[PDB]
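Hey all, quick one. A colleague (J.T.) asked me to put the sodium ion job into the tracker so the inputs and the structure tokens live in one place instead of scattered across chat threads. No bug as far as I know, just bookkeeping. Sequence used:
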Amino acid sequence: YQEPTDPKFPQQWYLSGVTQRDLNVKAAWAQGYTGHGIVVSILDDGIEKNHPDLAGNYDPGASFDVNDQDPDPQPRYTQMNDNRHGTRCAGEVAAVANNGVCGVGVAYNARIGGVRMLDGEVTDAVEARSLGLNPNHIHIYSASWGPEDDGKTVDGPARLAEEAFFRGVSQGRGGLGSIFVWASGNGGREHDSCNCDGYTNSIYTLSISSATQFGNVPWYSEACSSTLATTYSSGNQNEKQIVTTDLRQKCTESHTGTSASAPLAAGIIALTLEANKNLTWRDMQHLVVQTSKPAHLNANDWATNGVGRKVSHSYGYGLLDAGAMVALAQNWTTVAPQRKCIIDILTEPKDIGKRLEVRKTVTACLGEPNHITRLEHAQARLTLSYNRRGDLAIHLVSPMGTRSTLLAARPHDYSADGFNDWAFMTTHSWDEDPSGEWVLEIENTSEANNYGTLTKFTLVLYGTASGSLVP
Ligand SMILES: CC(=O)NCC1CCN(Cc2cc(CN3CCN(c4ccncc4)CC3)cc(-c3cc(Cl)cc(Cl)c3)c2)CC1
Ligand SMILES: *[C@@H]1O[C@H](CO)[C@@H](O)[C@H](O)[C@H]1NC(C)=O
Ligand SMILES: [Ca+2]
Ligand SMILES: [Ca+2]
Ligand SMILES: [Ca+2]
Ligand SMILES: [Cl-]
Ligand code: NA
Ligand code: NA
Ligand code: NA
Ligand code: NA
């Protein structure tokens, strides 16, 4: 195997490193996996399809302009180069290799397109038409953005966009399911908590956070239990950043944020799908859980879950490992059909006050076709009123003892509107047996005499009843 000769490949430290602080992508390339035959689409502000490092891999069938309603996602050029982000992300996935231009994509033989959908009013219809673009041609969708990362918003896909997610994972990709890769958010300095973003909090998105070059939680990171895994991105000014294609046929060394991490994950997932084109959308999440690596990622919340995996709310299961992903993909056995066990918990509404604990022992649908002994995602779907939402912290403890933070205190969130059947999701109990006692904790983190009521708590378990590995 000959590594890429591109002039900036040495600067792509998160691919080219020899110090073990990388995504182990060279290992996958040397196994023969470069993304050939895989199609990725960047949902963003457009894609410069004539960029010298993108043209060779550009795919019009992976592209559309939902903002102006035409097939051509070319960016709108402006004096501040506002609409450059999709081009940056496209190159992360699939910049052409060995062509003397900039660097390379993770999946430098994949086909790459873009949906121009952020340069205009983003409505539910816009979102749905983007997520649902050509779902039997595009394999993987990469989305770096969502509701405002202001630390006070709770929002998610409205009806058309949620329908697009379920159509995508159900019928997309020939029934194997569209793979939606999402950035968990850039709201760190606003103390944002990413389960309040219903796109990344969805089970249908494979959500990705960031690590700095020195292995730290970047200033912009949002912690939450819905995150699955991590890729490198930017940090402080002594740490390197992401190197990729830029608007106006240029090359940037200063692509940043969690919004730069999701495309790298999309590229790794493209390599993995080349290694096994039969993987379902859930198979892909299983591979990420099993192969991702905590080592050398610094966080004060690493915890071992009930099946012996370390998990963090900043990093999920750790750094994606492309070589491990493609290796495990090749002989992966398709997971069983997804089961869903619905448990209505409360017998009566509960005053929250300063603190509320709800304990419930469940059988996880014992005796039923939705009996789950092997958890995937779990949700606590909560309906509650409270006078100042951001003073709440919410935790969910599984029978195996795994304490998932569903909501951290959000100091800017002054809302008195509470949560209306909000489906807080955790990945941290993946592969655990969910039978037994679950505990929901709701706490007022402020000294104020806050008040409200929990009126509904639905525990929703997803998973299967066969095929577990030894912890
Ligand atoms: C009841 C009802 O109809 N509510 C409709 C709302 C519509 C709205 N969304 C939430 C939302 C909002 C927005 C819009 N923001 C996102 C950031 N951005 C920039 C970021 C950086 N520089 C320049 C621009 C544009 C401004 C972008 C998405 C979204 C994003 C992607 Cl990448 C993929 C997909 Cl699918 C979505 C999502 C919630 C539902
Ligand atoms: C894909 O997986 C399904 C489910 O196990 C199986 O029925 C089918 O034969 C597989 N197809 C290929 C081409 O491997
Ligand atoms: Ca256009
Ligand atoms: Ca190149
Ligand atoms: Ca956020
Ligand atoms: Cl469902
Ligand atoms: Na965001
Ligand atoms: Na997700
Ligand atoms: Na534990
Ligand atoms: Na149990």
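Adding what we noticed when we looked at it: The two ends are 35 Å apart (CA to CA). Helices lie at 13-16, 25-30, 85-94, 124-131, 159-171, 261-275, 281-291, 322-330.
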